Design an enzyme around this catalytic site. Structure first.
Site, PDB file in Angstrom:
ATOM      1  N   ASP A  65      36.391  -5.143  24.221  1.00 30.73           N
ATOM      2  CA  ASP A  65      37.772  -4.953  24.621  1.00 30.73           C
ATOM      3  C   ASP A  65      37.876  -3.969  25.791  1.00 30.73           C
ATOM      4  OD1 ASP A  65      40.557  -4.998  24.765  1.00 30.73           O
ATOM      5  OD2 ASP A  65      40.781  -3.823  22.891  1.00 30.73           O
TER       6      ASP A  65
ATOM      7  N   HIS B  73      42.904  -5.914  25.980  1.00 33.66           N
ATOM      8  CA  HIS B  73      43.992  -6.458  25.187  1.00 33.66           C
ATOM      9  C   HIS B  73      45.334  -5.928  25.661  1.00 33.66           C
ATOM     10  CE1 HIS B  73      43.981  -2.794  22.500  1.00 33.66           C
ATOM     11  NE2 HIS B  73      45.276  -3.054  22.558  1.00 33.66           N
TER      12      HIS B  73
ATOM     13  N   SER C  68      46.073   2.771  23.469  1.00 29.19           N
ATOM     14  CA  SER C  68      45.026   1.785  23.687  1.00 29.19           C
ATOM     15  C   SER C  68      44.539   1.816  25.124  1.00 29.19           C
ATOM     16  CB  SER C  68      45.556   0.433  23.389  1.00 29.19           C
ATOM     17  OG  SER C  68      45.597   0.221  21.988  1.00 29.19           O
TER      18      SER C  68
END
Ligand SMILES: Cc1cc(Br)c(Nc2ncc[nH]2)c2c(Cl)c[nH]c12
Length: 270
Positions: free
Chosen positions: A89, A46, A212
């Site tokens: 992800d 992402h 992330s």
């Protein structure tokens, strides 16, 4: 010889990769990643012009290709009114040039590899199952992730809720942005996810957006094994509720993919 440090931000976390995507609407987006071989950085799908750097260098490494997990689809569940879905992800950034391992650039161990079997001083018949049982037992697991504070790298201790607290941790996904109307929490928390955060057993720090893609690590037997990839959180902290959980892709659940993409990296996947 993975997951090993010597006697200094990127000295102490030498696998850490910093990622910037400079998107033509004038806002830089940040992510992290881990060096997993001399050609590859592991990160979150992402997060995606693209700037990757290792070892705390100012230099931006030349990217060859970015490989996405075939089952990743941020938009996969819009029809069901779920704005973003983070299943699978994970992404691999392939570099054009061989990284040079040093004291500032070293690879982390991945699950179900010989590297991890050696790091954990386990026997040659050690199976993928036995590794999972050692690294992810059914309890609260001490782990860490690596963050950026004031342009230096900082470890943060967290606990994966993988025993009696797992359900409680996963249910808290109800408070995340856009998931408040979800009837079945397992629509958004899939078997790909590990869960950290909250105040029991300890007051875990939380991830920021810019963390992330970075590794969730187990520190065991003086080595660092990567168990997950930081995906998403319930609140953006950067008053923190005790329902502020973080979710990570459990790498034990994406091995067909990891094995295939990393088949030439001499990692000795089991
Ligand atoms: C690291 C991180 C990523 C994402 Br995406 C977030 N957002 C979100 N969660 C559910 C739908 N979108 C957050 C939040 Cl919120 C805190 N930390 C995050």
């Amino acid at each position: 010889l993975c997951g090993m440090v010597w006697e200094t931000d990127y000295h102490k976390q030498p696998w850490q990769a910093k990622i910037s995507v400079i998107r033509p609407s004038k806002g830089h987006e940040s992510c992290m990643g881990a060096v997993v071989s001399e050609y590859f950085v592991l990160t979150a799908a992402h997060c995606f012009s693209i700037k990757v750097s290792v070892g705390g260098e100012k230099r931006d490494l030349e990217i060859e290709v970015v490989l996405f997990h075939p089952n990743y689809n941020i938009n996969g569940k819009k029809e069901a009114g779920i704005p973003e879905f983070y299943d699978y992800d994970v992404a691999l950034i392939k570099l054009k040039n061989k990284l040079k391992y040093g004291q500032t650039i070293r690879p982390i161990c991945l699950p179900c590899t010989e590297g991890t079997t050696r790091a954990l001083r386990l026997p040659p018949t050690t199976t993928c199952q036995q590794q999972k049982e050692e690294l992810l037992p059914a309890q609260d697991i001490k782990a860490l992730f690596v963050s950026e504070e004031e342009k230096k790298l900082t470890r943060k201790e967290v606990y994966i809720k993988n025993g009696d607290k797992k359900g409680s941790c996963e249910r808290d996904a109800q408070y995340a942005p856009g998931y408040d109307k979800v009837k079945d929490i397992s629509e958004v928390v899939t078997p790909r996810f590990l869960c950290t955060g909250g105040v029991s057993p300890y007051a875990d720090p939380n991830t920021c957006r810019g963390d992330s893609g970075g590794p969730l690590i187990v520190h065991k037997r003086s080595r660092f094994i990567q168990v997950g990839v930081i995906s998403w959180g319930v609140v953006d902290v950067c008053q923190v509720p005790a329902h502020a959980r973080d979710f990570h892709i459990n790498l034990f659940q994406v091995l067909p993919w990891l094995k295939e993409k990393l088949q030439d990296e001499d990692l000795g996947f089991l």
